[PDB]
């Protein structure tokens, strides 16, 4: 029900600054734990 506004934090002001930190993860078929910020892999075999 809310109008679409170019103001996301609802402070009535539109910010135009672009000072941020950037992180990235790869999406590949054969990813494993220990790289790409991967900490755990749970393989589920029999899904109903």
């Amino acid at each position: 029900t809310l109008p679409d506004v170019e103001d996301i934090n609802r402070d009535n002001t539109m910010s135009t600054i672009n000072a941020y930190y950037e992180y990235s993860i790869d999406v590949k078929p054969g990813m494993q734990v220990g790289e790409n910020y991967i900490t755990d892999i749970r393989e589920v075999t029999n899904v109903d």
């Binding site: 749970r42 393989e43 589920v44 075999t45 029999n46 109903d48």
Partner: protein, 367 residues
Amino acid sequence: DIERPITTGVPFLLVAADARAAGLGDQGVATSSDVFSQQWNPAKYAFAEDAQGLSISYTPYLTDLANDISLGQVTYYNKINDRSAFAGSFRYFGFGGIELRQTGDPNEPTREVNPNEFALDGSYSLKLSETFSMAVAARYIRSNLKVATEEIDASAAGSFAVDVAGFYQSEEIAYSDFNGRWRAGFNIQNLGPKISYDHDDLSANFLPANLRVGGGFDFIFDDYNKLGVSLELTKLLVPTPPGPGTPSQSQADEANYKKYKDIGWVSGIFKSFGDAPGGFSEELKEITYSAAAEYMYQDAFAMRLGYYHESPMKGAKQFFSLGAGFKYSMIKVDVSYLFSASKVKNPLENTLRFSLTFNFGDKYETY
């Protein structure tokens, strides 16, 4: 601690809802006939001394913290003949009103929701012999504990169950020092299809199908004093979830859980007697027991003591219970208190359960 407890849907069906049975260590399958004899044994409704009875029972949760979080019960029995009786019970566990608000507007119409769980059941009891009776009960269970938000549907989950009960009450038999009375009872309850809280055939929970077998004896002194000792054994009729593994590493557990969850309730009732690496000695660990003694003075004062013990490996709910009952003219008031003896914090600690019943209609002679 608890090792692989049995998980079932709507566990509130297993909570004692009246003060009389609460004071007797959560047993009623073989005690004297009373208005609250619907959760325990409807078959003794045919043995009721009074024609018609109504009862309101209150079990508060978080007594100090807040009200409205409680299990209430309304029971009404009516024995039309000397041989049969119709009874109807309504158990309601509720948290009271909860207000849902997303903005700090002082003037804002907000949504008040009451998550709850109620079971409405009706039982017919018929006296087969002069000392034995059967009973069949139909129960509808509805759970509305979740709250409607985004990406969450609060549709209530419903189910049906059938209860088969039997009660035996012997004649008053004279002995050397007293003239006591024997009672026995059995009850197979909560027999029905699984309840799906997510409304999906893939995810369903077993109903808490239960088997209760008990026996009791009354020592009658001077015809005005009674001392009834009762013992009840309770066993869940639901398969025990697999533990370490009964065939990679997690794949064995996944296969075991898939096998366990793909079991019908009818087959699950019979599978409950076993389906574990342990034998009969370990099978006896699935049975919980309760022993109580109730003293009756002038049939108007009742002092009840009880002890309830579950296995330490499941549930872990052992306690002692005290209860007092007073009948003024036709109104009986029961109060119950619980002293826990287990390591897990019982939510019924420091709680005084209340029960209030009215009896009306003509009197039926006891045989």
